[PDB]
Amino acid sequence: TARTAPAGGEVRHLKMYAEKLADGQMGYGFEKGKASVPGPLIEVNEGDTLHIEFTNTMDVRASLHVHGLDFEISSDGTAMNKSDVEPGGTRTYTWRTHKPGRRDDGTWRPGSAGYWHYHDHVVGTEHGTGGIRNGLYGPVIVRRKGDVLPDATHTIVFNDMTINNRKPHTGPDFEATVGDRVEIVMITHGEYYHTFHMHGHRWADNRTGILTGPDDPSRVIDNKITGPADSFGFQIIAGEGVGAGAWMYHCHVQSHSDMGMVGLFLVKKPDGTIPGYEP
Amino acid sequence: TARTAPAGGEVRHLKMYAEKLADGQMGYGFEKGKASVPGPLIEVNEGDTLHIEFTNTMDVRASLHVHGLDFEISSDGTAMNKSDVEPGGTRTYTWRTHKPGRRDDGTWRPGSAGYWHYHDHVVGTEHGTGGIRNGLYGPVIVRRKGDVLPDATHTIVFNDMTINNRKPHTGPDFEATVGDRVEIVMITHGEYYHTFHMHGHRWADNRTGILTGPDDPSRVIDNKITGPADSFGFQIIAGEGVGAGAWMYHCHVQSHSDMGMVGLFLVKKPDGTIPGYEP
Amino acid sequence: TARTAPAGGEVRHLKMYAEKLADGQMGYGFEKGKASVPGPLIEVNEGDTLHIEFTNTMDVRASLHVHGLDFEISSDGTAMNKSDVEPGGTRTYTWRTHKPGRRDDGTWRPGSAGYWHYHDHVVGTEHGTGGIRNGLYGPVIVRRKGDVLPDATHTIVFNDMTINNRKPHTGPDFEATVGDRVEIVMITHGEYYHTFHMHGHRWADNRTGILTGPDDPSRVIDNKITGPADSFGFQIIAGEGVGAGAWMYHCHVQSHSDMGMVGLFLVKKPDGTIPGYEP
Ligand SMILES: [Cu+2]
Ligand SMILES: [Cu+2]
Ligand SMILES: [Cu+2]
Ligand SMILES: [Cu+2]
Ligand SMILES: [Cu+2]
Ligand SMILES: [Cu+2]
Ligand SMILES: [Cu+2]
Ligand SMILES: [Cu+2]
Ligand SMILES: [Cu+2]
Ligand SMILES: [Cu+2]
Ligand SMILES: [Cu+2]
Ligand SMILES: [Cu+2]
Ligand SMILES: [O]
Ligand SMILES: [O]
Ligand SMILES: [O]
């Protein structure tokens, strides 16, 4: 009954922009004037190739750098390799992915599938400390053939003392209906360690956050320590075994949650009601 | 020979209290005047339901909030849900648990088993920063049918710069005899990251701390980074392959151990002696 | 065709020294006057016993303490057990290791294989805060029968705000040719949490950094949070699917990389050239 990922690989083309935003932040977008923080999700299947035509519309040098995926040195997007982009410039980055498989020597090649991310490597400092602070980051998902696909995917980025660069105590909030298969991509950036926590839900601490069967010994968790550039993801069944509610998620570092690193996973009945909860 | 957990689920009733202590701290107990920090261990089998008649005996609002287990929103113990308890009041919290199994859609449902914990979510702040600092935390274990049961279970909580809210350099110490199966439940709370370390012993970094057989690829470790609200647990054979001794456990963050986050795992010969140890 | 580890255990002997260095650092060596920071790599097979004749050539007390391996209390290298070594002194430390297997009771005993380390436990403080800060640390590898052996092993230690006690922005750098099987042993020490990252390469988050086959659910990563005394290790195929290049590795905690916790993994073509780069 559950929707499943197909095999790659297709060659895919895509435009991407970096824009400085009116409030001082910086964001990526698939369309000029539609930059967001986090940047848009890129999802591919193992084997796919992605050619990203990237345009830097800003007054400063900027780049696109990615985790996990196969790229040649000319596409790591760092200053050292002159792989970043001049103001007003355009460059085509190529990301590639591969399936797992046996090497000639008999060992097993891992394969690209997982929850990754992309970000700037050049604004502010040669490690993109400025870019990253301002919002130049976004999620990437590489699916393995056979992976369980969600109804929806949300991205939660712990960037310094903010969630998704939002002001303290301003979410983001997410909504689902009891029974929705919800996917979270959880990314951390900046200076601090954090512990991501979801009330009422839990996942497996492995590649997919799901257990394929009774033989997987991965810890089942609802809390997880994370540091800069760490990424993981998982799927849950909204309100499974617990019912509808305004379920908090937050960083569990005590002063962080006290100072606003909090949001709500709003799980609704088919009638839209949530027990407790107003606003 | 090794005793294993049975199947649930029974419906179990329990009473619990929150008390302010003479010394300014706060603790939970199963009986009034027998509060402890950490609180008493709650251990159940997958499928069990637990109804906790909880009384807040303090002058401030307080709550019980649990990780991992199934509870409806009315039992999350947060202020927002009006799920906490007035001074002098009594509420019944329900914790449910479930076995893993196949969902209608063919996917695999995780199951409650693991090393979890409970704590206050309301004293001092809406995240229980005061509650937690003062001592309102305790361990929870949910067993899977077939899990290996220990001789004893000890709880070690790294709460800010303390172990079990104790003064620097005052343990706690634990005693065992060479050959004893010892379970540790290891929980972290507060502001800081820590690294838990035990001399002379090691465990698997998975759900149970134990490898089922030769196919489990989990790292075997004796050191592990933890943050606020992380919980894990494991079993070791006291002095297995290493003999009797005063084996330290400590946080390995250098200034933390220097400033007192240290205790002793006292493994004795059957005669009661420990090589190279006092007093 | 991939070279694999044999079964132990042989009884092995080894001399090791602690020396104060001209610039005020402290290091271990296998030979007096050839001390290094990190200390030299110790590699054994499961079942091997290692007798280390350790001489302290400094004016302060010092010891050798190891993680993970089997040692009796008389070889834990701590002051409390009078297991450290007086100035000019010599002591023989014994490290044993064991294969995994079935216990009498039917459970599975874990086995020593993994990425470990050794360090001083006595210089500066009873926890070796001075020793460790000055450079008294080195790696240990214990192989399981059948483990894949690399072309080379490099040791990367994040010690406080340094890599291998080096000056900010001075590497170390490592060189390989596309296709070389490169093993990293990654160790962390001191006060700080860190986040290890390699551009262009990835590994499995398990014991060996390698997936055995398609049944292993371990997250494949290129980024990893670590704390004091954490050790892990992995194997990668240099430039696998990405080609030649000056691939950065660094701590990804933004101020850390900015302030110099950066190195280069120089993957060369057979001709010696690196696209980039250049000297
Ligand atoms: Cu980088
Ligand atoms: Cu945080
Ligand atoms: Cu919670
Ligand atoms: Cu990065
Ligand atoms: Cu909470
Ligand atoms: Cu600590
Ligand atoms: Cu140790
Ligand atoms: Cu909590
Ligand atoms: Cu120690
Ligand atoms: Cu760092
Ligand atoms: Cu990177
Ligand atoms: Cu240590
Ligand atoms: O990066
Ligand atoms: O929580
Ligand atoms: O240690």
Say if the Cβ atoms of C76 and B247 lie within 8 Å.
Answer: yes
Give the three-class secondary structure for C86.
coil
Task: Measure the CA–CA gap between C178 and C266, rounded to whole angstroms.
Answer: 10
State which CATH number among 3.40.50.300, 1.20.1440.60, 2.60.40.420, 3.30.1490.20 fits the domain covering A148-279: 2.60.40.420
Task: Measure the CA–CA gap between A40 and A49, rounded to whole angstroms.
Answer: 18
Q: What are the strands of the beta sheet with A42-45, ordered from one edge?
A: A42-45, A137-143, A114-119, A65-66
C-alpha B94: how far from chain center: 19
* Domain range annotation of chain B: 1-147, 148-279
Q: How many helices (H) and strands (E) does chain B have?
A: 2, 21
C-alpha A57: how far from chain center: 23
- Residues in chain B closer than 8 A to A219 (CB atoms): 114, 205-207, 232
Say if the Cβ atoms of A129 and C203 lie within 8 Å.
Answer: no
The domain over range A1-147 is classified in CATH as 3.40.30.10: no
Question: Can you tell me which residue has the tokens 């079935």?
Answer: C102
Residues A141, A146, A152, A158, Cα dihedral to 10°:
-30
Give the residue from chain C lying closest to B218, CA to CA: C206
Single-letter residue type at A7: A
Residue pair B121/B131 in contact (Cβ under 8 Å)? The answer is yes
Single-letter residue type at A74: S
Task: Measure the CA–CA gap between B96 and C196, rounded to whole angstroms.
Answer: 39
Token representation of residue C246: 């000056």
One fold for B1-147 and B148-279: yes
Token representation of residue B264: 């002793």
Task: Measure the CA–CA gap between C43 and C144, rounded to whole angstroms.
Answer: 11
Token representation of residue B249: 């456990």
Task: Measure the CA–CA gap between B259 and A132, rounded to whole angstroms.
Answer: 36
Start-end of H helices in C142-263: 254-258
Return binding residues of C: 65, 67, 119, 121, 194, 197, 199, 250-252, 256
Q: This structure's resolution (angstroms)? A: 2.7
Pick from A116, A65, A70, A109: nearest CA to A91: A65
Give the three-class secondary structure for A68.
coil
Closest Cβ–Cβ partner in C82, C204, C212 for B276: C82
Token representation of residue A198: 């979801």
| Residues near ligand 2 ion, CB 5 Å cutoff | A 194, 251, 253, 256
Token representation of residue C176: 């390989």
Q: How many helices (H) and strands (E) does chain A have?
A: 2, 21
Q: How many CA atoms lie within 13 A of B214 on its CB side?
A: 8
Question: CB count, 10 Å around CB of C153?
Answer: 16
Say if the Cβ atoms of B213 and C107 lie within 8 Å.
Answer: no
Segment (H or E) for B132: helix B129-134
Token representation of residue B71: 């509870």
Task: Measure the CA–CA gap between B116 and B62, rounded to whole angstroms.
Answer: 20
Question: CB count, 10 Å around CB of B269?
Answer: 14
- Residues in chain A closer than 8 A to C211 (CB atoms): 100, 108, 110
Pick from B25, B52, B27, B53: nearest CA to B40: B27
What chains are in contact with C, requiring at least 3 Cβ pairs below 8 Å? A, B
- Cα of C108 to nearest chain B Cα, Å: 6
Q: Is the peptide bond before C277 cis (omega within 30 degrees of 0)?
A: yes
Buried b vs exposed e over A89-122: b needs ≥16 C-beta within 10 Å? eebebebbbbbbeeeeeebbebbbbbbbbbbbbb
Task: Measure the CA–CA gap between C230 and B60, rounded to whole angstroms.
Answer: 41
DSSP secondary structure, B23-37, as one string:
TS-EEEESSTT--BS
Strands A11-20 and A49-56, bridge-based pairing: parallel
Residue pair B27/B19 in contact (Cβ under 8 Å)? The answer is yes
Residues A139, A144, A147, A153, Cα dihedral to 10°:
10
Strands B194-198 and B223-226, bridge-based pairing: antiparallel
Q: Is the peptide bond before C9 cis (omega within 30 degrees of 0)?
A: yes
- Cα of B37 to nearest chain C Cα, Å: 27
DSSP secondary structure, B55-124, as one string:
EE-SSS-B--EESSSB--GGGS--TTTT-SB-TT-EEEEEEE----EE-TTS-EE--S-EEEEEE-SSSS
Handedness of CA A218, A220, A225, A227 (dihedral sign): positive
| Residues near ligand 4 ion, CB 5 Å cutoff | A 229
Task: Measure the CA–CA gap between C175 and B198, rounded to whole angstroms.
Answer: 36
Say if the Cβ atoms of B245 and C70 lie within 8 Å.
Answer: no
Token representation of residue C204: 């499995």
The finding on whether A119 has its CB within 6 A of some atom of ligand 13 is no
- Cα of C205 to nearest chain A Cα, Å: 9
Question: Can you tell me which residue has the tokens 């590639």?
Answer: A96
Cβ neighbours of residue A134 closer than 8 Å, sequence gap 6 or more: A24, A25, A26, A123, A165
Q: Is the peptide bond before B172 cis (omega within 30 degrees of 0)?
A: yes
Q: Is the peptide bond before B88 cis (omega within 30 degrees of 0)?
A: no
A68 to A142, A222, A257, A273: CA distances (angstroms) = 9, 25, 30, 41
Pick from B45, B104, B109: nearest CA to A201: B109
